[PDB]
Ligand binder design. Structure first.
Ligand SMILES: Cc1cc(/C=C/C#N)cc(C)c1Nc1ccnc(Nc2ccc(C#N)cc2)n1
Ligand SMILES: NCc1cccc(Br)c1
Ligand SMILES: [Mg+2]
Lengths: 415, 556
């Protein structure tokens, strides 16, 4: 009810980010949402003395027909002070990633009850554009904590602890973690038990509020069933020349990760200039090198540790037939997590939808494990991604990304 | 008197840390000084400016310019320095409407709002920064000191503040009359409708009365400007639009700067004239920018100009947007990385046209370029119409399927249909996913000495075929490609090729059909002739037989 002082980083201006083009359907949805928000005092119209801007668009959350406004505060988030005044941070709960079920709740609506510092509001400016620029875009700024700004969970944090006090006291085994507009709630119960404690949790926030449009929904995760990817080699009875070349290639690649991988015995087997499809019997020496390589690959990689002072990088490879592989790391060859996807819903003829869903899943996994989002290296042309990703986005945060324009040879090794 | 609503002032600041201007007033002729004192006395009675005392420490220079072929001087306050110190504003005019997104109108009336412009007061705390001085006659008295009370012409903030003040005044009228459109440009309001002529003039008179609430008077003697409008390089008519006339000069010899404005006219023309091409004429501007240099036109640039002249021989027109109908976009390939398109809702009535040009790059293919053109049209269409058009594309459905399922990147194009108008985009070759049984296996290698730039490229095969070729003025990367080319040239219709070149695989896995490198083009030409090619990669320097033999032959 009383403002927290907020400033930008030293020697740093407000965002001046261009609004990207919006479809007719989204413009209309945003006009209706914002007209309602304005009557509720959440936002106010601004004049031309405010030169700042942040893009806005609209999404449909996963399994609903109602539009949600999303503001791309990425630039504002970079330029906003860091928030360590009461807390150096919320030490990321390492137990969250071991619950059998973790549900994600959109609690962003609760932020709208806290006024935003009067001197900072101008920096939250945004524009609803009009088709063909036929009328001036509608300019607003926030009067209350906006969804998607990093300061909102930080400023609301004291109020959140208090609302959850009774539920924490009564269900002490539950792990509750807040990231931006999301609440992650992890338990070890069976799904019906779980769904009912989740609904229990909702009650406390309807209770405190007295209505949140997207508080009812629940995205169900199972991090204990999260599968990984060690490096495995084929098991064959007949090896062709081609088979052995692919094996030596993969092993050469693995040797950058694992110290003692050897290929010299296997590379001997290629001696001669044989047809690619000719079967080569393995020598005893080769069989032994192969077996010892197999043993090495069954152990964890050496000297791999997460460093919170460094960014997480996520790489993704398109493997074909709806399958995607990805690795998360901070230093080359020191993977912190690898994985694979194939489940990509209603996207069997749409690569870009599949990739956009992959990005959101990987980002969710990153939040649960480390409490932050990775920087993606996307196997896609920038113009294709920028034109389409907002049509399949269902998350309330947005990660950073760059584009890969040269085909990686390592695709072959994660397949 | 009738009270009038005051116009809320916009608060204005200087940039952080800056003070206002303190610029010396230039000395003026007794003739100029007298003119300014008259102009300013009248402005002062009108309320636009006020005399100020000697405390105000700021100043901006004022000039008297002879309005050509008249004895009348006019006042110019030079705000360049204050503009450098004034804050940034939100500017709304950055995106101008495109005519092809406008809607048909029966009537469009123009209202003059030039007097409105100085009804707009200037923020009181900012006025001190607008101070200016009329010098006195013979410098024998203090100069007459004034400041502005209204937005000055030439001040950085006047356009945005005027536009936002007018928009706020007009908003209730527009909201409560959804059957009209209002657009402000310079000192005029344009009001369009589909109403019957009498209803339309009634809405006009109601808008005049609404504007009176703020004391804004509009000239009764209706505007001289009437449809058609010359606007922003277009000609707007009630139900059609076009670009203003495109005339290409006859010239015996062309300069850099001439070519720049030719390419200028042609780009402007390309939004309604189908098929305009500019690649060869833009090529003449490669690299150099000595604006008076004469450039001989290539035979290729002369042909392109000639074909453009033919296209521009006759006027064309665009139609306006009908929201009740779908948008269709049709694209054609033109050669040398050039693509042209038309957007329409009924056949043969284009809303607009356009072109897309290949990005500078080392290697390319038609499908990627087609894909990029589609995303550009998609994006432009969202801006103009708020929706994606349906596409008609010169690529078979099966070609597309094969491309995107096998390409190493994610890629997508929205709902589209094949149009069978050549030249068709197609896949010229596709590598095998598995080694070919019964095909000869070529192990290739090349290497070069980086000091002397001498090298070798060659192969050996499972049938004992061998070839090494000595090369001069070459690099490791060139020799690796040469070796692959030799294997393609000397093999049958089906071939397995084994290479250790990550560089060569990088290129081939990107599936170019055309390259900047003539060596890669030669490889592409060979690939097109084959029935099956399997390309295998192995790491270098490992004892890989076949590779290990021809590595020793070419690195010797
Ligand atoms: C952008 C714009 C420029 C001018 C005028 C600019 C100038 N000068 C006049 C108007 C009224 C508008 N605004 C809109 C909005 C929607 N449809 C239209 N259609 C439309 C506009 C003019 C003519 C004509 N003749 C026909 C249809 N105009
Ligand atoms: N150049 C005059 C003209 C007349 C009618 C329609 C169009 Br478009 C252009
Ligand atoms: Mg070599």
């Amino acid at each position: 009810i009383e403002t927290v002082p907020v400033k930008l980083k030293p020697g740093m201006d407000g965002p001046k980010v261009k609004q990207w083009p919006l479809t007719e359907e989204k413009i209309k949805a945003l006009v209706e949402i914002c007209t309602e928000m304005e009557k509720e005092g959440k936002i106010s119209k601004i004049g031309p003395e405010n030169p700042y801007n942040t893009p806005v668009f609209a999404i449909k959350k996963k399994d609903s027909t109602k539009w949600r406004k999303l503001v791309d505060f990425r630039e504002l988030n970079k330029r906003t002070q860091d928030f360590w005044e009461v807390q150096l941070g919320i030490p990321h709960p390492a137990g969250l990633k071991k619950k059998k079920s973790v549900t994600v709740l959109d609690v962003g609506d609760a932020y709208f009850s806290v006024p935003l510092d009067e001197d900072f509001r101008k920096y939250t400016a945004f524009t609803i554009p009009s088709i063909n620029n036929e009328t001036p875009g509608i300019r607003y700024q926030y009067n209350v904590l906006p969804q998607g700004w990093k300061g909102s969970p930080a400023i609301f944090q004291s109020s959140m602890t208090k609302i959850l006090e009774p539920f924490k006291k009564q269900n002490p085994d539950i792990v509750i973690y807040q990231y931006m507009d999301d609440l992650y709630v992890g338990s070890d119960l069976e799904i019906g038990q779980h769904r009912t404690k989740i609904e229990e949790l909702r009650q406390h926030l309807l209770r405190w509020g007295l209505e949140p449009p997207f508080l009812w929904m629940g995205y169900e995760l199972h991090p204990d069933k999260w599968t990984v990817q060690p490096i495995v080699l084929p098991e064959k009875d007949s090896w062709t020349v081609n088979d052995i070349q692919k094996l030596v290639g993969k092993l050469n690649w693995a040797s950058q990760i694992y110290p003692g991988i050897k290929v010299r015995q296997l590379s001997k087997l290629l001696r001669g200039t044989k047809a690619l499809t000719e079967v080569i019997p393995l020598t005893e020496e080769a069989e032994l090198e192969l077996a010892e390589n197999r043993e090495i690959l069954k152990e964890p990689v050496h000297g791999v540790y997460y460093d919170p002072s460094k960014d997480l990088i996520a790489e993704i490879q398109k493997q074909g037939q709806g399958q995607w592989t990805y690795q998360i790391y901070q230093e080359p060859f020191k993977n912190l997590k690898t994985g694979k996807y194939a489940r990509m819903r209603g996207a069997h003829t749409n690569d870009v939808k599949q990739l956009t869903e992959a990005v959101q899943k990987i980002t969710t996994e990153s939040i649960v494990i480390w409490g932050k989002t990775p920087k993606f290296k996307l196997p896609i042309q920038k113009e294709t991604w920028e034109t389409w990703w907002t049509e399949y986005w269902q998350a309330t945060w947005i990660p950073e990304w760059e584009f890969v324009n040269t085909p990686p040879l390592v695709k072959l090794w994660y397949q | 008197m009738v009270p009038i609503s005051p116009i809320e002032t916009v608060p204005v600041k200087l940039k952080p840390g800056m003070d206002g201007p303190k610029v010396k007033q230039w000395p003026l002729t007794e003739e100029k000084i007298k003119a300014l004192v008259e102009i300013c006395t009248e402005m002062e009675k009108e309320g636009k400016i006020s005399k100020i005392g000697p405390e105000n420490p700021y100043n901006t220079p004022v000039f008297a310019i002879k309005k050509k072929d008249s004895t009348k001087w006019r006042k110019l306050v030079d705000f360049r320095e204050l503009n450098k110190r004034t804050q940034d504003f939100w500017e709304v005019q950055l995106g101008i409407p495109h005519p092809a997104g406008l809607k048909k109108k029966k009537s469009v009336t123009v209202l003059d709002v030039g007097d409105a412009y100085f009804s707009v007061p200037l923020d009181e705390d900012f006025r001190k920064y607008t101070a200016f001085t009329i010098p006195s006659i013979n410098n024998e008295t203090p100069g007459i000191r004034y400041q502005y009370n209204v937005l000055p012409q030439g001040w950085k903030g006047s356009p945005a503040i005027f536009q936002s003040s007018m928009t706020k005044i007009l908003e209730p009228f527009a909201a409560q009359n959804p059957d009209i459109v209002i657009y402000q440009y310079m000192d005029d309001l344009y009001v369009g409708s589909d109403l019957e002529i009498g209803q339309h003039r009634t809405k006009i008179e109601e808008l005049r009365q609404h504007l009176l609430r703020w004391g804004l008077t509009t000239p009764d003697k209706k505007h001289q400007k009437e449809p058609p409008f010359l606007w922003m390089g277009y000609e707007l008519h009630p139900d059609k639009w076009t670009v203003q006339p495109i005339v290409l000069p006859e010239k015996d010899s062309w300069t850099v700067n001439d070519i720049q404005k030719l390419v200028g006219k042609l780009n402007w023309a390309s939004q309604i004239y189908p098929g305009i091409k500019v690649r060869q004429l833009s090529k003449l501007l490669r690299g150099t920018k000595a604006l008076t240099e004469v450039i001989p036109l290539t035979e290729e640039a002369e042909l392109e100009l000639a074909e453009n002249r033919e296209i521009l021989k006759e006027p064309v027109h665009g139609v306006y947007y009908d929201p009740s109908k779908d948008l269709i976009a049709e694209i054609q390939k033109q050669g040398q990385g050039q693509w042209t398109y038309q957007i329409y809702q009924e056949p043969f009535k284009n809303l607009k046209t356009g072109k897309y040009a290949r990005m500078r790059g080392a290697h390319t293919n038609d499908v990627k370029q087609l894909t990029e053109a589609v995303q550009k049209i998609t994006t432009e269409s969202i801006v103009i119409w708020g929706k994606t058009p349906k596409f008609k594309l010169p690529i078979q459905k099966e070609t597309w399927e094969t491309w995107w399922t096998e390409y190493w990147q994610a890629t997508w194009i929205p709902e589209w249909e094949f149009v069978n108008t050549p030249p068709l985009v197609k896949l010229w070759y596709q590598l095998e996913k598995e080694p070919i049984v019964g095909a000869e296996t070529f192990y290739v290698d090349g290497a070069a000495n980086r000091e002397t730039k001498l090298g070798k490229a060659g192969y050996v095969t499972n049938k004992g075929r061998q070839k090494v070729v000595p090369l001069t003025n070459t690099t490791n990367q060139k020799t690796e490609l040469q070796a692959i080319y030799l294997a393609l040239q000397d093999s049958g219709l089906e071939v397995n090729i084994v290479t250790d070149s990550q560089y060569a695989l990088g290129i081939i896995q990107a599936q170019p059909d055309k390259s900047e490198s003539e060596l890669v083009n030669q490889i592409i030409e060979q690939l097109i002739k084959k029935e099956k090619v399997y390309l295998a990669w192995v790491p270098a320097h490992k004892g890989i037989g076949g590779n290990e033999q021809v590595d020793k032959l070419v690195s010797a």
